[PDB]
Design a protein around this ligand. Structure first.
Ligand SMILES: [Mg+2]
Ligand SMILES: [Mg+2]
Ligand SMILES: [Mg+2]
Ligand SMILES: [Mg+2]
Lengths: 276, 277, 276, 276
């Protein structure tokens, strides 16, 4: 099965499909162990986590591809990738982004209508460029739109429907904060709709049962694990500096035995003995 | 201003012992700097297990490590000590490429070890000579890591360590040293700064900076401590989301958006544009 | 079709199949236009051409994979890649080499018995490692042996046969100076044999006709294009420094117009009209 | 000496300083052997040589940095690098480009006012962002303008003068074709002026004496060696396909002995015997 096929199979069998952000290869394997069928490479995560930069379009295609290759070399879960507006203003840049994502093992990408937004025609054209570039048609192109906050609900639908006619497989509407609005949007666009349930934003923490009731097909948790990981790391750094030892934070740590199980350390001995 | 190696030497000169914390990525390098550490570390076990999701069995290569060196040192000015395993290839040419690359990508220090079981004292000394000869900035620190204590005993470790120092090694990292009296004897004999590796769940006890200072240890390394806690916290988030169909029961464990914006200096970007424009 | 299927297809339908060294993406397009069915990434070429270094094992997996991705992103000819001894002494290292070459678009690789050579079992163990790692069985694993130089022709046949047993798809014996030796080697091993025909070596400059009558399946020209490129470049630099102008060497230059045709500049314009 | 100090020194001791295109690390060493004091990484050559792509802004920062690192790892001549418009539209992208070029060991970069061209103030903003990001003031920021061809000679001089006020160290006027105009321009802008003497374009093949008389401080041969290298390689591919052997083109090849001398093969044994 190709990555795109695994992504489409996951959307078809989980309602809605939980897609969890994985900041690195290690966390991709934790997400797999936890039972998730699909994982996410957050652009904000590549910026804030891998580069220690804010999410202001400083991160480019090479930075993201490094994290895509690391993740997909060890974890076979389908990876949805944030590619912002396509890493360059030209149809040729969007095309290079698509071909690179497919070669480095991504399952899907979302591309957004950020330049305020571009015209329905100009968003339609980024999608057409992406669909044309695609060498494996199972690879999923998800249109991300911030049209609800700028033009109103019907404009959001119109634009999403134009992206679908352009060959977008799924829709990611931004800044949508009522279940009743998701249900109307989902009926009007037809294709799978993703609900972005991040923390500390305008959206309520909608449950999978609530989103299922509103006919939402995907639920994304873009940075959740990253946020808990940073609080836990800061706690260790504070304690080592304050106490001159890690004695008082040992109880917060993954054990060496747990780490050896999560990266399948003993499968490597078991491979040596099978071959030789 | 100072070179990375100069900052590493100044840190060792002004902190007794110098706490050096593992930073799995650029974000955690900034957290360590905020916590007040003067030096940071790029664990090769952490590049393998964290960046690659692989065991620490020499699968990870120079290019995996250099990616993480460049990410960290592009945004964090703290001196970065880098695990380079045995130099990423058996040849003096391979050791030289590693050294010139670490320096070009902005590393302050590397440790290179005598693992294969250890190689002969002569082969370890040759590794150190190749590293020293390749060094283009003399301030860059070459730290010799030896497992000679476990394989051949204390006196053999001392002799191997002194031969590495005669070969130009700036600092020594003895592995498997489990008693304070052994640190004190070793430090008195080798003369150059000694690093104590205080990792968790191993045979080494969790010695405090006070204890290590009394044993005349110059550096204490906490190589995967933050990473270990990061992984348990991420696993607890994944488990809760899967079970509950929401992250409701793990919101309390999370760094806030406002906290994150503060730790990556989000508002310095607005203020840079104000200054230019 | 997969790159490996395309490479086996080429061996099967050209006798012997000519495989030319392509030092960069530009020269891979020139080789495709010149009508070749297969191309080659020389490890000596990555070293001397991409890194400006001697072929002394300084170049490693990431140097080669950069050149693989550059070539395979724009040229669809099956690419045979020189991977030395596997870029690390462990079966884990050989596994990561195989999996990365498949991922980054390579069609085949050769792996050799250099340490003087390793024992037959130690060479069998590399091949079993590579074969076990192969995600796509169409991907070609070519065993390269220097056993004829060290242990005589009967050893060379024996080692080759033991590599074929281990799942090596094709054999690359090193430096045969007589067609009779090649004819015997081909008949003993059964699987396709590769004749390395480099310049300024001990080997004669055998023709496709000669090697076809010795039952040789591939013929490699590893650095031919590169050696002519370097003399031409050196001639340009010498003239510019001597003359204070390039006037007297413009006659040896590919024109702008030819370059534009060789990198299909105008097809990028014909994509802008067909898409928008 | 830092790389930027080496470029600055070369400009003050050669009138005009010849700067030649080097497509790869091998050709940077050929340039050094030729006695050039400075070398150039063409953006068009990264695209056409390294990627086999047209020069339409498909190439990005990571493609360029790979070649910068390869060249500056073996060759100590100051490298001038083409960074297009800075690889992203924001001050932060330009700042990342500058810091990367300095870290990977580039001596200088040229950044251009292309979009048609941006406003004088938008170009000044690019230069201020690059100057502000510079950690090593010895690193040379050269402003490239196509103002002459859009707005005329006085416009181009005013723009070049505003870029100098913003900390631009040198100026690269595009599509300038009369020595008289070079001479006027050089007198007006005061800082060193580069003349781009590429083949098969509008500009005459002006000599170093001719450019010196016009008070031009640098002359660039951006792709000269690469054009010769492509024609040479193609001739090898055609001859191998037709003849079924490279025998009839051996005389156009750098010999093995010459290759080993140009990559200093024997300095590696001599390094070994000195060390151990
Ligand atoms: Mg994003
Ligand atoms: Mg280690
Ligand atoms: Mg080779
Ligand atoms: Mg250019």
């Amino acid at each position: 099965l190709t990555p795109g096929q695994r992504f489409r199979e996951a959307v078809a069998t989980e309602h809605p499909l939980q897609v969890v952000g994985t900041i690195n290869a290690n966390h991709a394997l934790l997400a797999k162990r936890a039972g998730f069928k699909a994982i996410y490479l957050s652009g904000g995560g590549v910026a804030a986590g891998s580069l220690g930069l804010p999410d202001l379009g400083i991160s480019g295609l090479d930075d993201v591809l490094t994290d895509v290759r690391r993740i997909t070399d060890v974890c076979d879960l389908p990876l949805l990738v944030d590619v912002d507006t396509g890493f360059g203003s030209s149809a040729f840049n969007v095309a290079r982004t698509v071909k690179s994502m497919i070669k480095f093992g991504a399952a899907a990408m979302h591309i957004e209508d950020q330049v305020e937004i571009v015209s329905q025609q100009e968003m339609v054209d980024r999608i057409k460029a992406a669909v044309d570039a695609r060498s494996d048609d199972s690879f999923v192109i998800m249109a991300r739109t911030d049209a609800l906050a700028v033009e109103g609900l019907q404009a959001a639908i119109d634009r999403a429907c134009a992206c679908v006619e352009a060959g977008a497989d799924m829709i990611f509407p931004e800044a949508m904060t009522e279940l009743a609005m998701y249900k109307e949007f989902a009926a009007a666009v037809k294709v799978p709709v993703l609900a972005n349930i991040t923390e500390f934003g305008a959206t309520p923490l909608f449950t999978t049962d609530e989103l299922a009731s509103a006919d939402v097909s995907l639920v994304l948790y873009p940075l959740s694990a990253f946020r808990a990981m940073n609080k836990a790391a800061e706690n260790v750094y504070t304690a080592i500096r304050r106490d001159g030892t890690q004695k008082n934070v040992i109880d917060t740590m993954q054990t060496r035995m747990e780490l050896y199980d999560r990266i399948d350390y003993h499968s490597f001995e078991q491979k040596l003995d099978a071959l030789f």
